[PDB]
Amino acid sequence: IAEPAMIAECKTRTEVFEISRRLIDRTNANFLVWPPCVEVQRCSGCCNNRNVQCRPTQVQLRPVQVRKIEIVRKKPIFKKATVTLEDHLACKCET
Template identity: 50%
Template sequence: MRAAVFHLLAGCLCLLRTASEESPLPRELLERLSRSDIRSISDLQRLLEIDSVENEVMEETRPGHHEDFTDLKREALPAVCKVRTAIYEIPRSQVDPTSANFILWPPCVEVKRCTGCCNTGNMRCQAARKHHRTVKVAKVEYVRRRPKLREVQVKLEDHLECLCTNKRHISPKSDTDNGIR
């Protein structure tokens, strides 16, 4: 749990640093966010002293698990081409390309992506099928010296199936090509 909170705060601090370079967010807001333990939109709402959010509050994320490193003499297993969980940092331009005077929470989400190695160097691991989904994120703007919290929709892409293809020949099929919605 502590590791998840640490990663969340590190992400917030990184985002706050970026936000402070791009636009003049009030220093008080940046300092308050950087010193806080934010685990949900409700926590963010309480921190900013905002009474309501435009939509229903999102589910809280679940903490990750830790691996046991007691047996270090195991044989190496190949990292084959397959779908794995990856971290996707939501670009601020994807939420609002016209303004830099806001922060996002959460700044990063989990997506499913094709990763791993193929048999030779001239092959690459690539998505054979993709699926698009929409999630809600919190957008905090500072309007007239007051924080304004809104939920916005962000479109994410998950990979469903992977295959090894020649690096020169790339033709992934999307979820709409395969009738998946």
């Protein structure tokens, strides 16, 4: 049996977000962070036509604590950093 294809509608789905070291610290390179990636909610899917794109209508800022190791003369200094994630809460087909 071949089922009718169903449209991937415009809505929030779980996507993989890579945590940017650049945003943790832009002025020093001597560090590691964990974890490297987290789940976020993002608007995806396809609208009726190509005059409209699937865009977020409301977004939820979400801070998360990542583990950080600064390497100083080959020894680790343990720190914590806060990364502010953005979740999409709702989407509509737009413009």
